[PDB]
Short mmCIF file of C-alpha atoms and ligand atoms in Angstrom, two decimals:
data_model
loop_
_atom_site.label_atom_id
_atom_site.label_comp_id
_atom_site.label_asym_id
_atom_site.label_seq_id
_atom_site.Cartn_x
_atom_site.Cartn_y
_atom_site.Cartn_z
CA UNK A 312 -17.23 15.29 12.54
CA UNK A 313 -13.66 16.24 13.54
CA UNK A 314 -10.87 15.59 12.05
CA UNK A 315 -8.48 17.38 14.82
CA UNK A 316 -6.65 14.46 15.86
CA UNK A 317 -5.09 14.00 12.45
CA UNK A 318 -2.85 17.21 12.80
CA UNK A 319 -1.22 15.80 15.99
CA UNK A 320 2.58 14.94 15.74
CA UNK A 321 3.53 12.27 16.25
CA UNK A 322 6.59 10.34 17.21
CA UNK A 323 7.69 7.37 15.39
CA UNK A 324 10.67 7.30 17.86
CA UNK A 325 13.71 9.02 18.75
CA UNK A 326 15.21 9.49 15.19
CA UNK A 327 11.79 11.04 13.36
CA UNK A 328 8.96 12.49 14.16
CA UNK A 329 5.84 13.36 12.06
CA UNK A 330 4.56 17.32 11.66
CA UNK A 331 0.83 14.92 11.62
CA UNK A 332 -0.94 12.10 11.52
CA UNK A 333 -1.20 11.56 7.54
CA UNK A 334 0.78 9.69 5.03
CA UNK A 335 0.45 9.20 1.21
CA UNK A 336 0.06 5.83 0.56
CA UNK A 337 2.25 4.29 -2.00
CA UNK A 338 0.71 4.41 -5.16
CA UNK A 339 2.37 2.84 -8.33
CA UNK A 340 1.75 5.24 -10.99
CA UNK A 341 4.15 3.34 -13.95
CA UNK A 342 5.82 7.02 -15.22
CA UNK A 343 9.49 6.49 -14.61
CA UNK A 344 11.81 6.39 -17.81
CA UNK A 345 12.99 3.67 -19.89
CA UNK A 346 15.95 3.45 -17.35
CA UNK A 347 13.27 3.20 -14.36
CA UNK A 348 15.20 6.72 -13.42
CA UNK A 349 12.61 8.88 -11.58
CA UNK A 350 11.37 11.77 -13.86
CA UNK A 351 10.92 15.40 -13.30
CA UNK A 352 7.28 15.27 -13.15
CA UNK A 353 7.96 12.54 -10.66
CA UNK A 354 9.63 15.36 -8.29
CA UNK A 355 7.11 17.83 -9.04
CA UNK A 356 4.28 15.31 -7.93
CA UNK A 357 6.09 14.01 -4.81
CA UNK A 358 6.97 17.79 -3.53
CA UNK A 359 3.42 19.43 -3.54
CA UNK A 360 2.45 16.52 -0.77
CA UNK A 361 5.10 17.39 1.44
CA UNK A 362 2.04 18.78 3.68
CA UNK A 363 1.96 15.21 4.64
CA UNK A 364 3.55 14.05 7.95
CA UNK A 365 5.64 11.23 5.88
CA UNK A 366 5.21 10.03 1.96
CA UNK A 367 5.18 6.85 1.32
CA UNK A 368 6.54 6.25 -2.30
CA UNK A 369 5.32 4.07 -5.43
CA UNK A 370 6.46 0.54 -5.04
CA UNK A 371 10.48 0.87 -6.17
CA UNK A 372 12.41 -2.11 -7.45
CA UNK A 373 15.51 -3.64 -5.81
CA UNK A 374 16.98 -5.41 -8.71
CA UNK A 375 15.75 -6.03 -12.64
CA UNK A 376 13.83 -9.73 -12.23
CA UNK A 377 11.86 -7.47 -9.47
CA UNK A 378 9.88 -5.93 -12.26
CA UNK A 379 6.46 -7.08 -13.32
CA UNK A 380 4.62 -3.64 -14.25
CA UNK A 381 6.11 -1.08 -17.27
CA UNK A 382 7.92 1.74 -16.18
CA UNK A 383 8.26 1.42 -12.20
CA UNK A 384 11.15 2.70 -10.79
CA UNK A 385 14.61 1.24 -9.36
CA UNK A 386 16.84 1.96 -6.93
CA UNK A 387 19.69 -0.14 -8.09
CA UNK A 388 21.71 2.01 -10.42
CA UNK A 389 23.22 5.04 -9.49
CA UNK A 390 21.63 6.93 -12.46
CA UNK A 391 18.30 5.60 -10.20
CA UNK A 392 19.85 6.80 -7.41
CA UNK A 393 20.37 10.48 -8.72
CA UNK A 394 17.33 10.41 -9.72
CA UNK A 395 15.50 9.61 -6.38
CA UNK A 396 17.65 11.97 -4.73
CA UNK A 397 16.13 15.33 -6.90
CA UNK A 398 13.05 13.88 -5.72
CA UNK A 399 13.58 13.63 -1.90
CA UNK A 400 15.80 16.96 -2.10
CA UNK A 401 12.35 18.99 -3.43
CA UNK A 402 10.29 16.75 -0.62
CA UNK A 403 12.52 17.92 2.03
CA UNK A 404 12.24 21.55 1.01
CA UNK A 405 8.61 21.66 0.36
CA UNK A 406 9.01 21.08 4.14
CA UNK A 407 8.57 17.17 4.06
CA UNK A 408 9.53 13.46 4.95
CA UNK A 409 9.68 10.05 2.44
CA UNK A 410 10.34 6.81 2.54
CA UNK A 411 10.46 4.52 0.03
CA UNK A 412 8.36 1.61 -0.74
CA UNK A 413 11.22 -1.81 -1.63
CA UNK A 414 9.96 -3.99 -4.10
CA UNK A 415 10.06 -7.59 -5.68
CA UNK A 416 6.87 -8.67 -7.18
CA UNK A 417 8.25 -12.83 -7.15
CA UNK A 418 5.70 -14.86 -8.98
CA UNK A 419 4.04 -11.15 -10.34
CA UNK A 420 7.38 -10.35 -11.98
CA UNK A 421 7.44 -10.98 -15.73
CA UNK A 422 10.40 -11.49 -17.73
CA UNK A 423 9.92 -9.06 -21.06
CA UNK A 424 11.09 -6.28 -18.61
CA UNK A 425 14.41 -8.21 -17.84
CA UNK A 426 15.55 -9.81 -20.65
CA UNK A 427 13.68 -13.34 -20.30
CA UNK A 428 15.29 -15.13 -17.38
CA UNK A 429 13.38 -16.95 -14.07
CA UNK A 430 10.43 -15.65 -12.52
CA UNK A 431 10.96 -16.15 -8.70
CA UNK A 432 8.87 -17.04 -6.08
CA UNK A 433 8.81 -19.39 -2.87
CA UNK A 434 6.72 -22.31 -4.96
CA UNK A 435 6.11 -22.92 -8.73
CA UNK A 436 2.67 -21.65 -8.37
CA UNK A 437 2.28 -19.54 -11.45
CA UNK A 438 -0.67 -16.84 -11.92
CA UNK A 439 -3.32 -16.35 -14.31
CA UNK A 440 -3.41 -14.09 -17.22
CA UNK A 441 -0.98 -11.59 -18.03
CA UNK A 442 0.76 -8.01 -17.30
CA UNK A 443 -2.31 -5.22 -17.61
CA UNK A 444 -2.49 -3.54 -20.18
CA UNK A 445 0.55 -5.83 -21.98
CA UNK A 446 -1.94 -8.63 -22.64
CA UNK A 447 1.32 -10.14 -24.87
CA UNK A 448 2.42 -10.34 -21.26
CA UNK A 449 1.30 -14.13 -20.25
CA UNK A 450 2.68 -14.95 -16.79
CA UNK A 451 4.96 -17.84 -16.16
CA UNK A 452 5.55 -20.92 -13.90
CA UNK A 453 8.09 -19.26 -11.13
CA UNK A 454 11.08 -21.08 -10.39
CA UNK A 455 10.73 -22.07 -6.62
CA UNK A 456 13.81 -20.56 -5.33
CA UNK A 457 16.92 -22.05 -3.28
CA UNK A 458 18.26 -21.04 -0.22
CA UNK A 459 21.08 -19.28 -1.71
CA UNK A 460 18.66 -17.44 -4.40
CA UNK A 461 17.12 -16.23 -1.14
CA UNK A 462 19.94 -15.01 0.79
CA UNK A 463 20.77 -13.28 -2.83
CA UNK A 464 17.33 -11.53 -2.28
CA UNK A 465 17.54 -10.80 1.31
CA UNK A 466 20.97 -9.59 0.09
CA UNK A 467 19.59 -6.69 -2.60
CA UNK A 468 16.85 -5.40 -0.32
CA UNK A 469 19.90 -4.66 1.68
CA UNK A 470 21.76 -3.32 -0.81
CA UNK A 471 18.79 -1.37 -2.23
CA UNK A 472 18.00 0.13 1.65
CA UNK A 473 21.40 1.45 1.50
CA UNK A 474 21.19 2.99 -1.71
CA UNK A 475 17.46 5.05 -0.48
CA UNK A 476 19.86 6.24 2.19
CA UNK A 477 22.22 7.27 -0.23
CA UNK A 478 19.64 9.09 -2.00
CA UNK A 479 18.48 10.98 1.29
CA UNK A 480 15.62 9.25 1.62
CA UNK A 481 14.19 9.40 5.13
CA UNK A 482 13.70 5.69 5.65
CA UNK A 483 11.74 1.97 3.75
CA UNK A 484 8.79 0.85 3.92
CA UNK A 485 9.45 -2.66 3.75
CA UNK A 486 6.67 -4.72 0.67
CA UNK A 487 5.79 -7.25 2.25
CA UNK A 488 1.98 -6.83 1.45
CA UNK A 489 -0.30 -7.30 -1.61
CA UNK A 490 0.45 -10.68 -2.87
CA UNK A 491 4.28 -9.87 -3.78
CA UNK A 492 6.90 -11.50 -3.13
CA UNK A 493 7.64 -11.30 1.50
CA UNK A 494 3.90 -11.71 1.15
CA UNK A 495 3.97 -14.91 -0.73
CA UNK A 496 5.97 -16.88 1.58
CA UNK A 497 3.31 -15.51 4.56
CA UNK A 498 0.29 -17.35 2.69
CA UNK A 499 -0.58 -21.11 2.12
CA UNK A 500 -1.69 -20.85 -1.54
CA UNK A 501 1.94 -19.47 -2.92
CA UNK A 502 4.13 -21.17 -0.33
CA UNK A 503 3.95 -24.60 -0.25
CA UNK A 504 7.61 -25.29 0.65
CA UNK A 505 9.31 -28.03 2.75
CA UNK A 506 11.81 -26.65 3.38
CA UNK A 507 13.04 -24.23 6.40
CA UNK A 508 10.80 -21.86 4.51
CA UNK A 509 7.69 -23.49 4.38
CA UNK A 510 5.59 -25.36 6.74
CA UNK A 511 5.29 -23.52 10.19
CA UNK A 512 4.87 -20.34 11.37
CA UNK A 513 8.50 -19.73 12.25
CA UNK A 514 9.33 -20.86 8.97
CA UNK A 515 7.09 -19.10 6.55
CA UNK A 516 8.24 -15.59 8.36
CA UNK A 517 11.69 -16.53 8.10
CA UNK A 518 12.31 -14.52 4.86
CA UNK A 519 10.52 -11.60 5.86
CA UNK A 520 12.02 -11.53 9.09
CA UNK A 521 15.22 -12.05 7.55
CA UNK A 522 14.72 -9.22 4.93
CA UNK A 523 13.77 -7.26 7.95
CA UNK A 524 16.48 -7.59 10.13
CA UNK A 525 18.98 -7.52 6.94
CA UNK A 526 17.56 -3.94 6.20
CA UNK A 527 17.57 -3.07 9.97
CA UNK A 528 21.65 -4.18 10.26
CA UNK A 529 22.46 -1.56 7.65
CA UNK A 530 19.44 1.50 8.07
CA UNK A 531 18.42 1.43 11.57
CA UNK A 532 15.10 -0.23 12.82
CA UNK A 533 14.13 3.89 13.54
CA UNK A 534 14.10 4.32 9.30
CA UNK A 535 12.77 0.91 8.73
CA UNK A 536 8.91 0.46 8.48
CA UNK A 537 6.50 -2.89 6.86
CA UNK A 538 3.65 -3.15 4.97
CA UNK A 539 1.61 -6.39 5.89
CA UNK A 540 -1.07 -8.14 4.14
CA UNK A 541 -2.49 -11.00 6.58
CA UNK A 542 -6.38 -10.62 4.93
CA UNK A 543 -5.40 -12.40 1.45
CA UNK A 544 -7.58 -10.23 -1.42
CA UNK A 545 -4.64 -8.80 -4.17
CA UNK A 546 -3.08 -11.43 -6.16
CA UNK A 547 -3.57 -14.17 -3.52
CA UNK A 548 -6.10 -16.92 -1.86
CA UNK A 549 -6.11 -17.46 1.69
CA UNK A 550 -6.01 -20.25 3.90
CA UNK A 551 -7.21 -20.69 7.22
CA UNK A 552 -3.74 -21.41 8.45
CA UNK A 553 -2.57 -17.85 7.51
CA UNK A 554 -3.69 -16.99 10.67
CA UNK A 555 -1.17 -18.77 12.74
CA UNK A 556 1.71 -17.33 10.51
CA UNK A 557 0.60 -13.72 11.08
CA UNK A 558 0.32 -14.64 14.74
CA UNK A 559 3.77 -15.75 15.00
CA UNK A 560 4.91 -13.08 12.88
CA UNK A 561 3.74 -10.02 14.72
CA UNK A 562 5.49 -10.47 17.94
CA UNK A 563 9.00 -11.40 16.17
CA UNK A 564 7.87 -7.81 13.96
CA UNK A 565 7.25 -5.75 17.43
CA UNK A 566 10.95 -7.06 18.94
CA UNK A 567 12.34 -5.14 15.97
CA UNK A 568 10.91 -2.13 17.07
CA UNK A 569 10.14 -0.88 13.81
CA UNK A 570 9.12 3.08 12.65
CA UNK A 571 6.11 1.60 11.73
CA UNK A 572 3.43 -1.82 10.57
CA UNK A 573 1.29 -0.66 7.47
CA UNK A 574 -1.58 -2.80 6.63
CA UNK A 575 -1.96 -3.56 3.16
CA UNK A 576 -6.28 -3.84 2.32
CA UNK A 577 -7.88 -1.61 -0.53
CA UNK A 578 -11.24 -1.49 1.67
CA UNK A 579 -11.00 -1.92 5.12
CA UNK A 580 -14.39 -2.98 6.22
CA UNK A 581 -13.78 -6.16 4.69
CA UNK A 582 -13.33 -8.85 7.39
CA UNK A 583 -11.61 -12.25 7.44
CA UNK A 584 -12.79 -14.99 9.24
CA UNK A 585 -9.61 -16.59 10.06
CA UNK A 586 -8.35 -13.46 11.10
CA UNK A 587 -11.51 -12.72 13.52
CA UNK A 588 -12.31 -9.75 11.51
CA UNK A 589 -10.75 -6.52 9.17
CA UNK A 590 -6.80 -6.83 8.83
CA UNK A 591 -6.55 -4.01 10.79
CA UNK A 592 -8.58 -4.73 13.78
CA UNK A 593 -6.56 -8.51 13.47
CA UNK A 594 -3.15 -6.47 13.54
CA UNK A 595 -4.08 -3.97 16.45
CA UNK A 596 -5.43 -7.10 18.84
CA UNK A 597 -2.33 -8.95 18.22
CA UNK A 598 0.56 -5.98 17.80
CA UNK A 599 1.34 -3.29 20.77
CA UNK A 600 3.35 -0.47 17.97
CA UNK A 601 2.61 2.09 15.71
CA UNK A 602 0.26 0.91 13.34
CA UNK A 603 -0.81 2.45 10.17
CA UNK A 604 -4.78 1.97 8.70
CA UNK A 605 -5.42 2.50 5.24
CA UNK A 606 -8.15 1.58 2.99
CA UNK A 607 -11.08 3.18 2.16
CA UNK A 608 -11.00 5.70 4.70
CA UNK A 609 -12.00 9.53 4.35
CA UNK A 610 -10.61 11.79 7.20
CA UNK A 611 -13.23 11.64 9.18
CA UNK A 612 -13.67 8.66 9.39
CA UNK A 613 -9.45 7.57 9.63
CA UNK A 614 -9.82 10.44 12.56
CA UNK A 615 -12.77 8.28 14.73
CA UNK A 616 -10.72 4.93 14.04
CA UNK A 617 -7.93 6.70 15.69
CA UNK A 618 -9.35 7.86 18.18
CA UNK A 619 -11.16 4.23 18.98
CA UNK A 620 -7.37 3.15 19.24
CA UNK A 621 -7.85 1.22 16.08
CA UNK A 622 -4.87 2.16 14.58
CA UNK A 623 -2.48 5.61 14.73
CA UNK A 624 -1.81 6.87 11.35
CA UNK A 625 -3.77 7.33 8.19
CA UNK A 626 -2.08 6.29 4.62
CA UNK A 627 -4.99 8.07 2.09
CA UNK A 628 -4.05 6.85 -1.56
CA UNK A 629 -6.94 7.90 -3.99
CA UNK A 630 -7.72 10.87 -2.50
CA UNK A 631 -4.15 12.00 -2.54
CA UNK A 632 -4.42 11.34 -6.37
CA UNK A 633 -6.73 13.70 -7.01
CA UNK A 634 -5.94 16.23 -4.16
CA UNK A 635 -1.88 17.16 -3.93
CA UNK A 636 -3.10 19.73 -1.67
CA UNK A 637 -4.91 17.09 0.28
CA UNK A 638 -3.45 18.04 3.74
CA UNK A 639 -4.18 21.69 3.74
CA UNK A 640 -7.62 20.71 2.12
CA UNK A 641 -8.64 18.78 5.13
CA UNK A 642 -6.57 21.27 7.55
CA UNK A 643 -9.02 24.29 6.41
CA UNK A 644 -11.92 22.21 6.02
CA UNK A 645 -12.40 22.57 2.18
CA UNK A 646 -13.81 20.00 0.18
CA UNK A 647 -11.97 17.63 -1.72
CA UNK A 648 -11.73 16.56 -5.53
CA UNK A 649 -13.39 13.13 -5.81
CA UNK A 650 -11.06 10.69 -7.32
CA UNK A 651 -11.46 9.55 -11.00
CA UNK A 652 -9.42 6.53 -12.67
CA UNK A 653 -9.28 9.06 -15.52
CA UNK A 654 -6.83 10.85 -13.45
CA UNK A 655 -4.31 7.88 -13.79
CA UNK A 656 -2.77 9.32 -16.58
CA UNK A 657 -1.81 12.41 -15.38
CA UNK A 658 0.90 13.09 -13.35
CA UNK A 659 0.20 16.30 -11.24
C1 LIG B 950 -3.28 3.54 -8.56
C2 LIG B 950 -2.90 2.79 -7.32
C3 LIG B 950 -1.59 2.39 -7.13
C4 LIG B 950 -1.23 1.71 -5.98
N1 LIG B 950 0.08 1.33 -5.83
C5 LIG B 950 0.50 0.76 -4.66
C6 LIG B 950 1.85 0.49 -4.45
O1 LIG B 950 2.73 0.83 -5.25
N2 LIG B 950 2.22 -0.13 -3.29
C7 LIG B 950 1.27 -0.52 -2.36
O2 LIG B 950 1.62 -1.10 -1.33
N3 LIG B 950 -0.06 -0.24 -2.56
C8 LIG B 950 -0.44 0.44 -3.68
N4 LIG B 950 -1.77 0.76 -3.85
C9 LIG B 950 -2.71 0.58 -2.69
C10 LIG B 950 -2.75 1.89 -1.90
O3 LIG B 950 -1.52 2.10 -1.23
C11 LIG B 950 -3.88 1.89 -0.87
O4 LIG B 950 -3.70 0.80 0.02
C12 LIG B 950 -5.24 1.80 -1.55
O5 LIG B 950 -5.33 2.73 -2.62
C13 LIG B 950 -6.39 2.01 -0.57
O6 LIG B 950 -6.32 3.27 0.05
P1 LIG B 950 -7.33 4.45 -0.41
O7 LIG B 950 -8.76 4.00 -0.21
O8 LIG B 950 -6.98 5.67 0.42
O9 LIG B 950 -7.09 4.69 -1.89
C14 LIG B 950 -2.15 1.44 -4.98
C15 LIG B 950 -3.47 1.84 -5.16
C16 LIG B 950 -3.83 2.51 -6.32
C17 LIG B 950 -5.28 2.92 -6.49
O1 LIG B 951 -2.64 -0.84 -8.69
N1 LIG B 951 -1.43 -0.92 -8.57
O2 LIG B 951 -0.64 -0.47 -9.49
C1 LIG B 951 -0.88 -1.51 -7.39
C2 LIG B 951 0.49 -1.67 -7.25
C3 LIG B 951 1.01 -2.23 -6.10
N2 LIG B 951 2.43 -2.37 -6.04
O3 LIG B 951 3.05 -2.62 -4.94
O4 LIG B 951 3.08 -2.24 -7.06
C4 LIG B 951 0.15 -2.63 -5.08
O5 LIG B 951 0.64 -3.19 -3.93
C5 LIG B 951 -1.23 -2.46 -5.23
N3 LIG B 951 -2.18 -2.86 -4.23
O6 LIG B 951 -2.10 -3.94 -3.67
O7 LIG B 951 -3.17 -2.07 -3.94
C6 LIG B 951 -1.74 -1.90 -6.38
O1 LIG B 952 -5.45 -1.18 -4.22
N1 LIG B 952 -5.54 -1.19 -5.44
O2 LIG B 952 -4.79 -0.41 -6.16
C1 LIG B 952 -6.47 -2.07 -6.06
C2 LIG B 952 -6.60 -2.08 -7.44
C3 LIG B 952 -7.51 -2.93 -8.04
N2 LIG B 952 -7.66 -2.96 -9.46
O3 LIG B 952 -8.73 -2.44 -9.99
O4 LIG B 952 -6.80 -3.47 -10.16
C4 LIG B 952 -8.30 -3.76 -7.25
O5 LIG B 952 -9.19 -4.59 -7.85
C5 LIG B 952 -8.17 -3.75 -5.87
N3 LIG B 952 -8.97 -4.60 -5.05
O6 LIG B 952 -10.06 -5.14 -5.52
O7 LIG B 952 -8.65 -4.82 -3.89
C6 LIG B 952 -7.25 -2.90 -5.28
#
C-alpha cells in the first residue's frame, strides 16, 4: 500500500512549512540532568530525526511544581535554555524543524522534585498510587487553585513560550492532552469547580483558551500548536458531559488559527461513545484546520487515513524510538525495527 502522500509538504501557514507529512511525537524519555538541562545525548537523539517534517519534543516543564516524572526537562532557567538551544541548533542543521512540547502535569506533579510545596490542579481530586518507578513517590491531595494561582500559570507558559523562542525553537506544542494539567480542567472527573472555571463549556475551556491566547500574544498563533485529549484514557475518567466542552472548545481553538490541533490517544481505534466515535474522527467532524492523528498508526496505514481526509499529519512515537532513521526508512521502502520497551533505556 502507498505511502506517497506522506512525503508531500505541507503548509502549516505563511510562517512554516513542512519538507513532509511526518512528525515525531513527543515522547518523554526522563534523561535530562539533575538541573533538567538537556544533555548531549539529548542533541544527538533529536538531530538524526531531522528527516522529519517537524519534531515534536518530550514533554518540557514551565516552572519547578510542573514536575511529576525524574529527570524531564525545563525551560525556565537560562542554563535550560542553553541547553535547548545546542539541541535545536544540531536539528536545524541536520536539515530540520522542532517545537517544543509545554508542560505542567497539575494533580500528576509530585512534590519530592520541588522541594515539598502544593500540588496544583483545578479540584482537590488527588490520584492513586505513586510516581513509577519512585514507588516512595505517593501522590497527594492537589490544592484546588485560585484565580490568581491561575493567571500565575497562564503567566509561565508565557514566559516559558518566550524562552523556546529564545532558544530557537521553531514553535509549542501547547499540553493540553493526557490527563495533565489544560486537560484537567476539560474533563468532569478532575474539574469539579464553581467557579468561572468550572461548570459550562465556556468555562471549563477558559484556562486553556487563556493559556492559548497568552502564548499566542507573545509567539505568534503561526508557531503555536495544541495537543487535545477529548477521549479520556491516560490518567483520567470521562464523563458524558466532556462532550459538550470539547464542542465548545474546538471552534474558540479554530478562531485562533493555530499551526496545528494534535490529538492525544495511544491507540486510535478506540472509540468513545460520547464523542460518537475515535478522538480523531470526533475532532475532524467538529474542527475545519490542520489536524494531526497519532496513535497506533504504521505509515501505511497514517497514509490511507490521510487520504480519507481523516486527519493531515502523522505524529509516529514508538516507531521513531526504535527507528531515528525512520523517515528515510519509509521514504526507500525498507523495513523498520520493531519497537521494544527494552529500548527505553537507551538514548540513540
Ligand atoms: C515512551 C513514551 C513517552 C511518551 N511521552 C509523551 C510526552 O512526553 N508527551 C505526550 O504528549 N505524549 C507522550 N507519549 C505519547 C506519544 O506521543 C504517542 O501519542 C503514543 O506513543 C502513540 O503513538 P505511537 O503508536 O506512534 O507510539 C509518549 C509515549 C511513549 C511510548
Ligand atoms: O509514558 N510517558 O512517559 C508519557 C509521558 C507523557 N507526558 O506528557 O509527559 C504523556 O503525555 C504520555 N501519554 O499520554 O502517552 C506518556
Ligand atoms: O502513550 N503512552 O506512552 C502510554 C503509556 C502507557 N503505559 O504503559 O504506561 C499506557 O498504558 C498507555 N495507554 O494504555 O494508553 C499509553
Amino acid at each position: 500500500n502507498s505511502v506517497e502522500n506522506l512525503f508531500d509538504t505541507y503548509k502549516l501557514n505563511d510562517t512554516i512549512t513542512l519538507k513532509n507529512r511526518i512528525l515525531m511525537a513527543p515522547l518523554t524519555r526522563c534523561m535530562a540532568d539533575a538541573n533538567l538541562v538537556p544533555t548531549d545525548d539529548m542533541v544527538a537523539y533529536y538531530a538524526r530525526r531531522a528527516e522529519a517534517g517537524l519534531i515534536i519534543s518530550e514533554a518540557t516543564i514551565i516552572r519547578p511544581d510542573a514536575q511529576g516524572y525524574p529527570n524531564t526537562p525545563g525551560i525556565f532557567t537560562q542554563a535550560q535554555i542553553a541547553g535547548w538551544r545546542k539541541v535545536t541548533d544540531a536539528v536545524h542543521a541536520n536539515g530540520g524543524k522542532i517545537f517544543v512540547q509545554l508542560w505542567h502535569t497539575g494533580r500528576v506533579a509530585h512534590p519530592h522534585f520541588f522541594g515539598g510545596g502544593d500540588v496544583l490542579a483545578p479540584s482537590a481530586q488527588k490520584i492513586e498510587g505513586s510516581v513509577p518507578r519512585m514507588r516512595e513517590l505517593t501522590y497527594v491531595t492537589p490544592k484546588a487553585v485560585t484565580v490568581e494561582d491561575i493567571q500565575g500559570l497562564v503567566r509561565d507558559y508565557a514566559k516559558a513560550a518566550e524562552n523556546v523562542i529564545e532558544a530557537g525553537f521553531d514553535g509549542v506544542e501547547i499540553h493540553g492532552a493526557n490527563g495533565y494539567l489544560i486537560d484537567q480542567f476539560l474533563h468532569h472527573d478532575s474539574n469539579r469547580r464553581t467557579d468561572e472555571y468550572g461548570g459550562t463549556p465556556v468555562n471549563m475551556s477558559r484556562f486553556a483558551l487563556e493559556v492559548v491566547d497568552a502564548i499566542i500574544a507573545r509567539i505568534g498563533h503561526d508557531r503555536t500548536g495544541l495537543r487535545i485529549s477529548p477521549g479520556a484514557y491516560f490518567n483520567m475518567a470521562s464523563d458524558s458531559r466532556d462532550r459538550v466542552v470539547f464542542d465548545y472548545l474546538l471552534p474558540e481553538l479554530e478562531k485562533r488559527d493555530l499551526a496545528f490541533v494534535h490529538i492525544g490517544i495511544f491507540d486510535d481505534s478506540i472509540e468513545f461513545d460520547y464523542l460518537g466515535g475515535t478522538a480523531s474522527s470526533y475532532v475532524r467532524a467538529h474542527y475545519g484546520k490542520t489536524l494531526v492523528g497519532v496513535g497506533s498508526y504504521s505509515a501505511e496505514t497514517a497514509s490511507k487515513a490521510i487520504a480519507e481526509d481523516k486527519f493531515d499529519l502523522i505524529a509516529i512515537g514508538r516507531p521513531f524510538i526504535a527507528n531515528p532513521d525512520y523517515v528515510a526508512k519509509v521514504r526507500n521502502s525498507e523495513e523498520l525495527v520493531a519497537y521494544s520497551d527494552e529500548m527505553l533505556a537507551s538514548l540513540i
